[PDB]
């Protein structure tokens, strides 16, 4: 369903269980930081 759920399954398919969660947390922190730094130009590149 939601993308974090999709991603969680993919990572569990390619990483050890411990690694998969760590990648997913890092991915979310990275994602969160990119939202905090969002500009109008970023939006316009969608």
């Amino acid at each position: 369903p939601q993308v974090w759920q999709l991603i969680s399954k993919v990572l569990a398919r390619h990483f050890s269980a411990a690694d998969a969660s760590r990648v997913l947390e890092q991915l979310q922190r990275d994602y969160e930081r990119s939202l905090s730094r969002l500009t109008l130009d970023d939006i316009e590149r969608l």
Partner: protein, 53 residues
Amino acid sequence: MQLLLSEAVSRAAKAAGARPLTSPESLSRDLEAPEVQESYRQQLRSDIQKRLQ
């Protein structure tokens, strides 16, 4: 902002210092599948409109 989920995960896996047990190509291929990439694109659009308000 990374547009491609495969690129965001590659950068996150390196930052976390985690290597796939399959291969980085198999992981990217999986994340580049149209459905999962579009789900990522739609989530991003949603979150951007959340930032915008």
